[PDB]
């Protein structure tokens, strides 16, 4: 997260870290046994780390649970990033508490201009790299479809939306992929891609979760 702020320990209790001997992507807990992340975050050997603040120190309230299923959307296109969504089933259910909690799925899509919370352990610099120990947070608005498409001609599918700031300086970044965009208490976005980070006229692009609520429910119900 570039241009954000320190969230505060466990203030984003649905935020998880995907770990393969290092943090590589975020995700969102949507019930005690299932996590939403990005399809491009798929790999073997994922350990889901819940209740985290400082990801480099065992502080208390962590739960480390192996992924037992990592389900990429069958129509994920790795070149366009269309359908960039993945469901992870935890090997055992997380223990839900004030510091480890699920986030609601949307019942309808969000509107341009609505303020959302984006969070993660990604790079905090728009030039070079600096990776934080503790979770970072950013308030950012959903942009209009025409502005999103104007920023990224020929690249925005109906399963994507833009959020952030065209003046630069505030954005998600490498390491935030798969993590949450939460608007009005609903998971509306998944950190996906962008041109650089926090660059002028290049907002973040996010998977449009409201288009996948039925697929998520049907996939969980059959697994």
């Amino acid at each position: 997260i570039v241009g954000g702020y320190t969230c505060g320990a466990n203030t984003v209790p649905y935020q998880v870290s995907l770990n393969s001997g290092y943090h590589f992507c975020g995700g969102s807990l949507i019930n005690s046994q299932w996590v939403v992340s990005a399809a491009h975050c798929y790999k073997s050997g994922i350990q889901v780390r819940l209740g985290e603040d400082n990801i480099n120190v065992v502080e208390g309230n962590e739960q480390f649970i192996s992924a037992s299923k990592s389900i990429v959307h069958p129509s994920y296109n790795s070149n366009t990033l269309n359908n960039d969504i993945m469901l992870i089933k935890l090997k055992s259910a997380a223990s839900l508490n004030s510091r480890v909690a699920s986030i609601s799925l949307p019942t309808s899509c969000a509107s341009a201009g609505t303020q959302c919370l984006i969070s993660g352990w990604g790079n905090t610099k728009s030039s070079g790299t600096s990776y934080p120990d503790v979770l970072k947070c950013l308030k950012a608005p959903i942009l209009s479809d025409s502005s999103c498409k104007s920023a990224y001609p020929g690249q925005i599918t109906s399963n994507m939306f833009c959020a952030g700031y065209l003046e630069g300086g505030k954005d998600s970044c490498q390491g935030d992929s798969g993590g949450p965009v939460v608007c009005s208490g609903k998971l509306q976005g998944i950190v996906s891609w962008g041109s650089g980070c926090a660059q002028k006229n290049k907002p973040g692009v996010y998977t449009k979760v409201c288009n996948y609520v039925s697929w998520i429910k049907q996939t969980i119900a059959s697994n």
Binding site: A38, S78, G122, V191, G194, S195
Partner: peptide
């Protein structure tokens, strides 16, 4: 020049 926001990034020539 566009990249996924994973570690490591997956990037396009553009």
């Amino acid at each position: 020049g566009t990249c996924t926001r994973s570690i490591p990034p997956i990037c396009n020539p553009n």
